[PDB]
C-alpha cells in the first residue's frame, strides 16, 4: 500500500502484524525479512528478524528446527557482524539450542543446553537491562531438570527482573521487538506461584 520505500516504516508495519500473527505464519514474514536485508539500506535488525521469525516455529517445529537453525544462525551472525546488539542475537540463539534440544530432552541437554546457557551468559553480559536475557534465563532454569542446579527458585529474581524492564519499555524507534513481555509477566506467576491473595486495599 503506497511506495513506503522507508526501512523504518516497512519494518513498522511487518513488526506491528508479527506480534498479530500466529508464529506459524512467520514463515511468509521471514522471508520479507530477508528480502529487506538482502537489499541496501537495511540493518543488522532485518536480520535479527528473520533469524527471529524461523527460531518461533522452531521450537514447534522440531522436524527441521536444526536446519532452519542454520539459515537463522547465519542471518544472526550478519547482525553480529554488521556490530548490532549482540544481547538480542544471543537470546534468539540460545532459544534456537533450545528449540533443537526440544528433539531429544532427555540427551540433548549436555550439549544444546550448554548452548543455550552459554549464549544466556553472552545475552546478560552484552545487555544486563535486557529483558529478554532475563526471560530466557528465567524460562530456562524455571524449567531445568536438576541439571543445572536450578530450578523456579532460581528463576525467582529472573522472572521479575524481566517484566520490571518492561515496565520502563518505552520501546524505540518503534518496531523494537515487543515479543517476550507477556511471556515474561506469565513466566512469572510460573517462576513463583506465589499465589498471595491481595484483592483488600
Not at 536485508?37 to 537495511?42: D, H, L, Q, T, Y
Not at 535488525?45 to 524461523?54: G, P
Not at 529472573?158 to 513481555?181: D, N
Request: net charge negative; proline share 6%.
Amino acid at each position: 500500500m503506497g511506495q513506503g520505500t522507508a526501512y523504518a516504516e516497512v519494518m513498522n508495519r511487518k513488526v506491528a502484524a508479527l506480534d498479530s500473527v500466529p508464529p506459524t505464519e512467520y514463515a511468509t514474514l521471514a522471508a520479507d525479512f530477508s528480502r529487506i536485508a538482502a537489499v541496501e539500506g537495511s540493518d543488522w535488525m532485518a536480520a535479527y528478524y528473520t533469524a527471529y521469525c524461523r527460531i518461533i516455529p522452531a521450537f514447534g517445529n522440531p522436524s527441521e528446527a536444526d536446519r532452519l537453525c542454520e539459515e537463522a544462525e547465519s542471518m544472526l551472525s550478519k547482525a553480529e557482524s554488521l556490530g548490532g546488539d549482540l544481547s538480542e542475537i544471543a537470546c534468539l540463539r540460545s532459544m534456537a539450542a533450545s528449540a533443537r534440544l526440544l528433539v531429544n530432552p532427555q540427551e540433548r541437554w549436555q550439549t544444546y543446553g550448554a548452548e543455550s546457557s552459554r549464549q544466556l551468559a553472552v545475552a546478560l553480559e552484552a545487555n544486563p537491562a535486557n529483558p529478554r536475557a532475563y526471560f530466557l534465563q528465567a524460562q530456562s532454569l524455571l524449567y531445568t531438570p536438576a541439571q543445572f542446579g536450578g530450578g523456579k527458585d532460581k528463576a525467582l529474581p529472573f522472572a521479575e527482573k524481566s517484566v520490571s524492564c518492561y515496565a520502563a519499555a518505552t520501546v524505540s524507534p518503534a518496531y523494537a521487538p515487543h515479543w517476550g513481555e507477556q511471556q515474561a509477566r506469565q513466566l512469572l506467576m510460573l517462576c513463583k506461584a506465589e499465589t498471595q491473595e491481595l484483592v483488600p486495599r
